[PDB]
Amino acid sequence: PGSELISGGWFREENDQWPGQAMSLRVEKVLYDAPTKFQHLTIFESDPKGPWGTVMALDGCIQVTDYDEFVYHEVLGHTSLCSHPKPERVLIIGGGDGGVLREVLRHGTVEHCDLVDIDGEVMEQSKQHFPQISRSLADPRATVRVGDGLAFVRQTPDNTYDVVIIDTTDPAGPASKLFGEAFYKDVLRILKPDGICCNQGESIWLDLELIEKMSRFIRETGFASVQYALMHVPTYPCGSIGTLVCSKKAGVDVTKPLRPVEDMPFAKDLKYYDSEMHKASFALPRFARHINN
Amino acid sequence: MPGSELISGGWFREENDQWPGQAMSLRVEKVLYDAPTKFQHLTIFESDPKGPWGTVMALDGCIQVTDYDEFVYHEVLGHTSLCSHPKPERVLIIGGGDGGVLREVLRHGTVEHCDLVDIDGEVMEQSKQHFPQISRSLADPRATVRVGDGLAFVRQTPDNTYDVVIIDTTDPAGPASKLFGEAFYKDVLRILKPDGICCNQGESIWLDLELIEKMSRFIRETGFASVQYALMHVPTYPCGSIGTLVCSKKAGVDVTKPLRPVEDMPFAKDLKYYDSEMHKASFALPRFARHIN
Numbered sequence A: 001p002g003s004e005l006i007s008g009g010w011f012r013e014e015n016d017q018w019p020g021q022a023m024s025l026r027v028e029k030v031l032y033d034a035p036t037k038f039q040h041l042t043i044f045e046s047d048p049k050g051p052w053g054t055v056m057a058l059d060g061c062i063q064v065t066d067y068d069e070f071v072y073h074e075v076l077g078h079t080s081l082c083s084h085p086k087p088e089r090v091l092i093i094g095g096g097d098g099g100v101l102r103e104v105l106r107h108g109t110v111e112h113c114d115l116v117d118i119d120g121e122v123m124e125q126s127k128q129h130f131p132q133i134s135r136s137l138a139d140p141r142a143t144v145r146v147g148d149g150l151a152f153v154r155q156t157p158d159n160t161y162d163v164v165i166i167d168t169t170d171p172a173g174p175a176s177k178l179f180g181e182a183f184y185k186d187v188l189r190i191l192k193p194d195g196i197c198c199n200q201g202e203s204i205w206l207d208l209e210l211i212e213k214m215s216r217f218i219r220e221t222g223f224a225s226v227q228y229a230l231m232h233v234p235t236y237p238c239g240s241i242g243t244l245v246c247s248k249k250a251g252v253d254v255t256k257p258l259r260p261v262e263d264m265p266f267a268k269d270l271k272y273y274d275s276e277m278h279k280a281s282f283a284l285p286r287f288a289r290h291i292n293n
Numbered sequence B: 001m002p003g004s005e006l007i008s009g010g011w012f013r014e015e016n017d018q019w020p021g022q023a024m025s026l027r028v029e030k031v032l033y034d035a036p037t038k039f040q041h042l043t044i045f046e047s048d049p050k051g052p053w054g055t056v057m058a059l060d061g062c063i064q065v066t067d068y069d070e071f072v073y074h075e076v077l078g079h080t081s082l083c084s085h086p087k088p089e090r091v092l093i094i095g096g097g098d099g100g101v102l103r104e105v106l107r108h109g110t111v112e113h114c115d116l117v118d119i120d121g122e123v124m125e126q127s128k129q130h131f132p133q134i135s136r137s138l139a140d141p142r143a144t145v146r147v148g149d150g151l152a153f154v155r156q157t158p159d160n161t162y163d164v165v166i167i168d169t170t171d172p173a174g175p176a177s178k179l180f181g182e183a184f185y186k187d188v189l190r191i192l193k194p195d196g197i198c199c200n201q202g203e204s205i206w207l208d209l210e211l212i213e214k215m216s217r218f219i220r221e222t223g224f225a226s227v228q229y230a231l232m233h234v235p236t237y238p239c240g241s242i243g244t245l246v247c248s249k250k251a252g253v254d255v256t257k258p259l260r261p262v263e264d265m266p267f268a269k270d271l272k273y274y275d276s277e278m279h280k281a282s283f284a285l286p287r288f289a290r291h292i293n
Ligand SMILES: C[S@@H](CCCN)C[C@H]1O[C@@H](n2cnc3c(N)ncnc32)[C@H](O)[C@@H]1O
Pocket: A058, A063, A064, A072, A093, A094, A095, A096, A097, A099, A100, A116, A117, A118, A119, A122, A147, A148, A149, A150, A167, A168, A169, A173, A174, A175, A176, A178
């Protein structure tokens, strides 16, 4: 999908990844619509009568809106770092909008974070059109690279990172191999012994089979535990998205915060996450419970 | 007020000024019913067979039930309210013409009778024709189903009649308008026994937080000792979640922790969403919505 999804004054998120349905947002003004070296990227201002603000899509899939971006950025950044006893070195694969990095960089334990995203235009357009999301990209604790995540992890030493956050687009497109076992084996390797990873873990309404397959192979590759956390995101298909939160060490329970954010100075700045939302996120509907046991 | 025009060009588009600038849309395979009733515009369609949704019902343009995800809200409102009551014998459902909450209520062996009053007789008839797995309890001998305005019904009902009242309404635009108002809740307080519980269709935290907070305030001021909002995951409500205000008439009641766990009941394994972990988790709210309680 590309430009054709902006039609009759609406962006219509039709995709064969979710046949028969489409979330639609009304378009006030298209700001940017262009092929990049890897994806089709569309940025528009939504109807000022509604709350969504600026919207970004990649290959026809809504990625961020001003209104709800905080949810997924806070969940991935804090569920993973508050599960880690001292997260000092962090990798973000994908993430070129800067939102997960903004949250990671709230933590005073972080010494460095690498962020590697295949598509340098996402960083550029995020700087221009989403300054509250992309401010973080310039921080000297970060090294921001344009490149493929799979090649990057293949060149990375053993035991490099305390946390890896895999903040990718859906499987159709350049993120395809980042949902595969060979990538996860590398993520396990580049984590330190107390390492934690988490990802963009898709929808229990549309992708339950892929989430089953992934949780299985991630455990089989050698992660000691894998728990899926659900969160409320209106502008992801069916209104929620989840993250598989994976511990390299045994006997770790990522479902209860190890280092609670309320004991951190920035707790009251967050709009979604806290420790009760952390715990609640791992309670799954009975039809999906088997992901977590 | 929308009607027939929302289906055009092969799709149903849920455009509504209750959520400006957004619309969920579903492909239409076949229109089964599409007509004004005495009160509302009722539309029923078979969605795309390549999609998971099945049969869809809308009232005044607003999606009410799909085959795929109807279980969520019907289990959450029925079991979250009944499992918070020490012995729920007499139950009233206002609205609920599809039968889905009633189906769940009648799984409880404590229930002696459940009265259900929906203003629109055509919803019950079409639910019997098009949604048999949702409407399978409307003709149960433990239920009495009446066609009428619930505002009048609660006014006429005597004090101290019900253990639990469940207000399963359409959104405020239309014939449900006064069921989001203070006079109605004064009657629901009055018709509850001293240890009564109610809960409602509590809208979206993303779209309706002003109204939801207004209601929590006046329901407390009316005389309910505690009002706590429970959130749940419903793809086919605007923004993907719906909440319910769960309100205890008496003090000393913690509706957020099940008083009678479903796991001790013979039907817990038949449910597709609800269980005690999910009941505890549903009362965790995102920070921005925390002032509801
Ligand atoms: C936009 S971000 C998701 C929105 C919430 N932050 C997802 C990013 O994943 C990148 N992505 C996709 N495939 C890859 C690969 N192979 N490697 C690195 N980054 C990737 C893609 O360019 C998006 O910017």
